[PDB]
Amino acid sequence: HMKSVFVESTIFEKYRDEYLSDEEYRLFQAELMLNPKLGDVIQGTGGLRKIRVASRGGSRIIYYFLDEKRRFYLLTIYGKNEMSDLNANQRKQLMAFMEAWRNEQ
Amino acid sequence: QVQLQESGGGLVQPGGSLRLSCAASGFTLDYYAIGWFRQAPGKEREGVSCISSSGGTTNYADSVKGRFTVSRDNAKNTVYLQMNSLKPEDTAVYYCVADFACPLIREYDYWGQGTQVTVSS
Numbered sequence: 001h002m003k004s005v006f007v008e009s010t011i012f013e014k015y016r017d018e019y020l021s022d023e024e025y026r027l028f029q030a031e032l033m034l035n036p037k038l039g040d041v042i043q044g045t046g047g048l049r050k051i052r053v054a055s056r057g058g059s060r061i062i063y064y065f066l067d068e069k070r071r072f073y074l075l076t077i078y079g080k081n082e083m084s085d086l087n088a089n090q091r092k093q094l095m096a097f098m099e100a101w102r103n104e105q
Numbered sequence: 106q107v108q109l110q111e112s113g114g115g116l117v118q119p120g121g122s123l124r125l126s127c128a129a130s131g132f133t134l135d136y137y138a139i140g141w142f143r144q145a146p147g148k149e150r151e152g153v154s155c156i157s158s159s160g161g162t163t164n165y166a167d168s169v170k171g172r173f174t175v176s177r178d179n180a181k182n183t184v185y186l187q188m189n190s191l192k193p194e195d196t197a198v199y200y201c202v203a204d205f206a207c208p209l210i211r212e213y214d215y216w217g218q219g220t221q222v223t224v225s226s
Binding site for chain 2 (some may be wrong): 010011013014075076078082083084086087089090092093094096097100101104
């Protein structure tokens with residue numbers, strides 16, 4: 001058996017089943033596995049990427065690929081206009097969050 | 106199953122106090138920002154307060170500023186809202202969210218059933 005390379009934040013876990021079926025989620029992970037740079041980088045986040053999944057409605061997923069361990073961190077998932085533009089203080093906190101989390105997991 | 110558990114509500118006289126609790130269930134809230142919004146019947150959701158994971162950053166809505174104090178205890182997995190000088194305008198059900206930063210990034214959404222706060226004579 002192999003340990004999973006995918007790691008869900010509490011927020012993502014809270015929201016995943018709403019936006020994706022298990023089958024769709026499996027395919028999304030498989031796409032990420034093959035192409036970890038699948039999404040586009042969100043500026044000033046230290047490499048967080050943003051990807052839209054077509055699926056109802058389309059979903060956006062935010063993730064970070066930790067290159068060192070080849071492991072994926074799934075931040076959050078949302079529909080159109082449920083998230084907002086970040087400012088400096090928020091990018092600061094978000095990067096610290098990624099870090100802290102990365103170090104607990 | 107992850108959720109936030111709100112408690113500490115109740116009825117109080119004008120000028121009175123209450124302390125509200127937001128306790129994570131099914132996860133650890135240490136690294137997350139937490140915020141409060143409230144909803145009264147016939148009113149839209151209105152943001153109340155928010156706090157960063159380290160506690161070094163707090164936010165308050167204008168109409169509660171000065172009166173409310175938000176704090177957290179990470180070892181206890183709980184966030185608090187100290188409400189002082191309560192006004193009838195503060196009557197509402199209070200709800201807790203978890204997020205990546207303070208100020209909040211995501212639009213308000215329910216993490217629990219909330220706690221009722223009534224201030225009246």
